[PDB]
């Protein structure tokens with residue numbers, strides 16, 4: 001470790017811990033920057049030489065975390081929990097958590113190599129037909145989204161899950177063992193326990209289950225309504241009106257957002273078309289425009305614009321040279337208080353416009369708390385970070401706002417239009433809830449040992465059927481590793497944050513609309529240009545993790561806990577409507593024929 005990066009000596013009292021944290025921040029910013037930079041060089045230009053540089057940067061970070069983690073223990077183990085400065089208690093608590101730095105050198109290198117190899121496998125996988133080969137983004141994504149051929153959709157779904165999942169399984173087994181070994185030395189029973197501890201709630205899993213119980217009826221009714229719509233297009237042979245939906249027919253590779261099948265379920269097509277993708281294309285929208293439109297919403301709230309370093313450094317389009325990239329959208333903080341970037345293979349679609357807002361929500365957070373101690377530069381909890389951009393997109397998606405930005409010529413305020421809009425939003429927000437919930441249930445079982453490698457896929461599809469009510473369109477077995485075909489698994493990114501975010505964003509929305517002075521239906525609110533709403537939001541963003549999220553939340557929404565009532569209130573109209581339609585259509589809610597799988601096409605795969 002560079003001598004300038006090594007910890008000195010500090011008094012074993014709170015006054016010395018303050019200087020300890022100051023010296024830590026100075027050195028930590030340099031170690032974080034070089035690490036994030038090396039990750040950026042790889043993810044924007046996947047080469048072996050850049051992967052090698054990234055693994056060495058990870059080794060340096062582990063060396064740094066070991067020297068400062070063990071110094072923080074030696075000096076402050078019996079007294080840090082009693083410090084008067086609460087932000088300083090949080091800094092020390094983070095520094096003394098070594099994570100992968102608890103591993104011996106050899107296993108550190110194994111650990112860093114696995115993460116690198118797993119990331120490279122996921123982002124370089126292809127579905128070859130043998131020279132012609134399709135990538136996940138854009139090729140397979142567009143097939144899942146715009147194709148209505150059961151066989152073509154099946155080819156892409158099966159192709160992707162086989163190409164990405166199968167080679168990942170042996171690596172994911174080794175990573176899980178090393179991850180658990182590392183965090184067991186921090187005092188956690190397994191890695192999942194460490195991940196859950198970020199929410200500082202002894203009742204976390206019970207609170208999540210109680211939230212999902214309130215939301216499940218909404219998903220069940222949407223599920224039955226969409227399944228009926230698919231049955232009218234695909235027939236009785238490929239859709240079982242009392243069974244799960246084949247997982248490749250919902251517009252998305254993971255059946256996690258159903259927006260792409262809106263055209264098949266829109267109840268009142270005579271009303272304005274809320275899918276403005278065709279208009280964006282007709283008008284000539286490009287990537288940089290989508291980001292400028294997103295930025296302009298943020299500045300309308302008196303939040304910060306994107307700095308020059310963002311526009312000069314960001315990758316907002318898939319490179320057209322001979323570069324392999326990680327196309328999965330992401331927002332980057334380089335921890336130097338200057339460089340902030342988004343990496344996204346942006347496509348001109350309505351859903352991609354929301355993704356742009358989601359990612360810029362991260363950047364805005366980074367910009368607002370960049371002056372806090374490096375350890376406090378994160379969300380109050382990870383769900384907060386995932387909710388910022390989505391709250392703004394809830395206003396952007398309103399028919400009235402789409403009209404203002406020239407994407408919707410006719411604006412109507414009638415009940416039929418309300419149902420159209422709320423159904424479209426439900427295809428995106430309600431359909432996701434089961435998936436956002438189940439991913440880390442699977443990963444928690446893997447970390448705990450409940451789910452050994454011999455049951456990776458068995459338990460994955462138990463949960464997919466249990467919560468989402470979908471089924472694989474081809475037979476699967478334990479050679480397949482379908483969980484690994486989802487970006488966040490090989491990239492080791494927790495997922496429960498997204499379930500928290502989809503509930504939280506409606507709490508934020510309700511509070512910001514109240515703050516803005518809006519007194520109409522919650523789903524028609526648009527906080528555009530509300531400096532008051534911006535001031536309330538800014539207060540959350542500038543807090544970082546300096547304060548417990550329960551208190552940050554109460555200051556914002558008046559409640560110190562996640563609550564599903566705002567989401568239910570947002571959707572009340574279409575919730576009632578979907579129940580009426582399903583009753584009138586004699587639908588069966590749920591999938592009692594849980595064992596059913598669709599047959600294979602007669603001409604498959606040829």
Ligand SMILES: *[C@@H]1O[C@H](CO[C@@H]2O[C@@H](C)[C@@H](O)[C@@H](O)[C@@H]2O)[C@@H](O[C@@H]2O[C@H](CO)[C@@H](O[C@@H]3O[C@H](CO)[C@@H](O)[C@H](O)[C@@H]3O)[C@H](O)[C@H]2NC(C)=O)[C@H](O)[C@H]1NC(C)=O
Nearest residue numbers: 398399400401412413414518519520521522523524525526
């Ligand atoms: C779309 O339209 C709804 C409904 O509008 C209402 O019903 C129509 C059939 C007409 O009779 C309209 O004249 C009538 O307003 C709008 O929601 C409504 O917004 C108004 C404010 O613009 C609300 O009135 C306020 O209500 C609060 C109490 O909540 C009072 O304190 C205020 O003094 C004021 O009266 C009204 O409650 C609200 N109605 C419902 C059912 O939510 C909606 O704003 C509109 N959408 C857009 C984008 O304009």
Ligand SMILES: CCCC[C@H](N[C@@H](CCc1ccccc1)C(=O)O)C(=O)N[C@@H](Cc1c[nH]c2ccccc12)C(=O)O
Nearest residue numbers: 256257328329330331354355358359428432491493498
């Ligand atoms: C909308 C943002 C998509 C990209 C995002 N990308 C991640 C980068 C993660 C990362 C961490 C560390 C290192 C590298 C990468 C992010 O920004 O959080 C993402 O993954 N969203 C989720 C859920 C979701 C939100 N809104 C939706 C709307 C519809 C459907 C799903 C979701 C998903 O798509 O599964």
Ligand SMILES: *[C@@H]1O[C@H](CO)[C@@H](O[C@@H]2O[C@H](CO)[C@@H](O)[C@H](O)[C@H]2NC(C)=O)[C@H](O)[C@H]1NC(C)=O
Nearest residue numbers: 041044045046047048049050051319321322323
């Ligand atoms: C992708 O990364 C590689 C490094 O792995 C870059 O290649 C280097 O380019 C510089 C200048 O062009 C040369 O001096 C080095 O010798 C190259 N190294 C290797 C290993 O080839 C490459 O330029 C990067 N590509 C992009 C588009 O940034």
Ligand SMILES: *[C@@H]1O[C@H](CO[C@@H]2O[C@@H](C)[C@@H](O)[C@@H](O)[C@@H]2O)[C@@H](O)[C@H](O)[C@H]1NC(C)=O
Nearest residue numbers: 158162473474475476477478479480600604
């Ligand atoms: C796992 O399955 C692989 C692919 O074939 C699968 O099983 C056959 C019977 C068909 O149902 C087909 O649609 C499926 O995709 C096999 O190649 C592989 O041998 C299987 N692995 C084990 C361990 O049996």
Ligand SMILES: [Cl-]
Nearest residue numbers: 382494496497
């Ligand atoms: Cl999380």
Ligand SMILES: [Mg+2]
Nearest residue numbers: 145260349351
């Ligand atoms: Mg779409």
Ligand SMILES: [Zn+2]
Nearest residue numbers: 358362385386
């Ligand atoms: Zn995010």
